[model samples]
Target: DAASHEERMNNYRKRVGRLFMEQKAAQPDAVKLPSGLVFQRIARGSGKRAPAIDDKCEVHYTGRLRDGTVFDSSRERGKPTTFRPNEVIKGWTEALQLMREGDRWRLFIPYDLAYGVTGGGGMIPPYSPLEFDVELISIKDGGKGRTAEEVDEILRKAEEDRE
Candidate 1:
């Protein structure tokens, strides 16, 4: 009288671990962000200002473990998601802010910026690295303009609470 459907991602876990190590070995072109979030700009935007901490941003994004498994994808939903920079994971929030509207990036997030050693549970395992493909759609409401660095601090504080 209960659980019927189950999707097990058991096989990809080991593959994910191996791929993560390779991703960690930086290539010459890799752009390292402030918090261990490494990225490569897939489609550069017009190169204007990126979102500040207070701005609401719209984006289409997909997240994966190193093994090419899809953990989450806004692209699958066929709808972009909008949220303030403070509302996401530390890695995403920072990397997203590093781009301008219309930019698309592939990011390699280390364990600290990601789910950490404990993992977020389920799809994300302990000490796992992650990859994300994200498109920044738009940024609006600059009235606050609180600064992306503020979001960084807030995210760090929030992570401590999680521990």
Candidate 2:
């Protein structure tokens, strides 16, 4: 029974892997890299200082798959997204840090740096890369917001308490 179970799991994994590889191969060569990453940038706002991780900023962005299928968009959602720069995903944290108020940038995110091998929700399959065109519409002082280190400390303490 154990051997059979393992065999079935292996087959499932292989199927998923094959599907992922096929999808990656089918993406546009313009942005795709040999490493299986794809991305492009559009500058909407330039000449501004990139915000720190704790700063509060407003932005509009469109996220898509390699085939240009729109998965998410703040603009299309009828509202801009605002958050402390470090509170979001790694790709966003890195990309937004490179932007300033009234500046926009396009981001090409590799899956490993993004959701990684696990991918994200069902909308994003495992190991899928993502694309984003982001506009940094504004920034306000994130007064009293905790720094990344502080947030990490708080989480560490919480985990310790649970243990």
Candidate 3:
């Protein structure tokens, strides 16, 4: 049986509103940068300097839901992953851009600034707000800069490795 158009429209609007509320609720109380970036320092690392956009940085990250249910982690894999700050999702790029090589931060990423409505994979659902505890390990220039194609290639490889 077909659902009424009004019912479908209402469902869509509710979903959209839920997404917006999630995003708003994730806003951090820490310093808000000029670029609309907000962050809170959980623990400070005393290592090398922070990395640049084209630089590679090794980090151990643990992702969780609002209820503190762990979803992903590099520490669980027993290895840190390296990537350029500008190569990942917007929330990561913005958060890392504010951290130094040794900084550890609890990042609250709003959906609009994160994977957003589409999400990354099945692990993350649409319109979900994400939480991450990211630790900066090491930093290095990622060699000859990466283009969109190269970045996508790396992302694809990472996704493949994830599972």
Candidate 4:
């Protein structure tokens, strides 16, 4: 029998939440920031600069759930994504500011800093924390680069082209 849709699906939020807490505790090397974002440097970069929230930067990233299921990956697509630091979620915005060209990090983002209560499309669930392997590929200072509005338009047009 096809029971109710809700009964048939596994609500992974509670399970993932438990795993999140366990990972944070078991992984003593992971540093927790004031915002509750946790991270571990994979490879420290040699650059002298990091991006500001308004700065335009390019990064390659893979996003995953606690169970090691990948939800998205720029590496798999063979293209890096570009955007201003202000455009991403709170955790990404915070983490990106601490990265420089050539740097890589494994970030553990609390649900509040990620998709949060809304989760996302169908892949993420409410209160679900996430993990990401993010590399800072490049950066263009806002002073020498596009303004916030221009960046928005550029990214907006890119999305339109994808459709």
Candidate 5:
């Protein structure tokens, strides 16, 4: 039963992943990158520039599975999230560098660029293709409201927490 359970889940996830990939690829307005990340703009932003690879990004987002299961969200917590563009999953890292501040995008991420074959803990399954609505709030210069000098100081203190 134990071995059967694992095989069953893998089959289910693989089937859903293929179905989701086909659906997204057929969308007329969606754009697919060379890395297999598919996305479309839900709303446009007026920012003149997109974020850099090392820049920290502030955004609100909701993540869902192919079956419309809500796995995570920042809006539910009543605050936006801030993180480095390069520190996230491959799909997110590529998408963020292309999005301007205030833009909202619906991203279709393949499993290889997401949680991968091992999956994401208990929420996402192996071979799962996921979706998300991400809104870019701002491109912070390392930290919010702080100058370059202060940014380095804060980083020096928080560097330990990174481990």
Candidate 6:
């Protein structure tokens, strides 16, 4: 019989919490954004302006938890993922909007900006902080996803919600 799954999960959360704290202490050069997202540039791409939230982006990335467990990786698949920034989590949406094409960055996202207290399925635990190594490959403007006006409103709302 299944027993004490919640207890096991709680223990894992404690371990992850400690790991996140340790990682943060060592990340002296990381840039902390207003929303508590931390990031560092690994490579400065030649592309100029960053993408708008509604624009479609192609990117390669590896997602990990605080314990160095890789949950997902576009690199492993040998193909990048493409999607609009607005469709992703808050941390990713914000970070992608700030990244230029070809830029590679490491993002440290707080739980609220990630999957939040409920977490993401079984791989991510409640209160888990996420890390990602991201590379922006390219972007397509005039995307059909969301209107610029809508994107603007969403951005404004997200900013207001942060504080």
What lDDT does each candidate get? 0.69, 0.61, 0.64, 0.74, 0.79, 0.77
Query: Which candidate wins on lDDT?
Result: 5
Number of the candidate with higher TM-score, 1 or 3:
1
Task: For candidate 5, report its TM-score.
Answer: 0.80
* C-alpha TM-score for every candidate: 0.69, 0.60, 0.66, 0.75, 0.80, 0.74
Candidate 3 lands at a TM-score of 0.66
What ranking of all candidate models by TM-score puts the best one first? 5, 4, 6, 1, 3, 2
Residue 12 lDDT (model 5): 82
Tens digit per residue, CA lDDT, model 2, 100-121: 5655555666666577656677
- The candidate maximizing TM-score is 5
Candidate 6 lDDT over residue span 2-41, tens digit each: 4588778767776777568457635655666667777777
Provide the clashing-pair count of each candidate structure: 0, 2, 1, 0, 0, 0
Off by over 4 Å in 4: 1-19, 142-163
Model 5 lowest lDDT segment of ten:
154-163
Off by over 4 Å in 1: 1-25, 142-163
> Candidate 1 deviates by what RMSD?
8.2
lDDT of 5 by residue, 11-110 (tens): 8888879889778966877766667788877998766566777888998999999988888999677866887778999999878877777779999999
lDDT by residue (18-125, candidate 3, tens digit) is 664445334543543333334557776654345567778788899986556899899677856877878888888866655665678777666667776676767776
Deviation of model 2 at 56, angstroms = 1.2
Tally clashes: model 1.
0
- Greater-TM-score candidate between 2 and 4: 4
Clash pairs of candidate 2? Answer: 45-103, 45-104
| Decreasing lDDT order of the candidates | 5, 6, 4, 1, 3, 2
Q: In candidate 2, where is summed lDDT lowest over 10 consecutive residues?
A: 30-39
| Cα-based RMSD of candidate 5 | 10.4
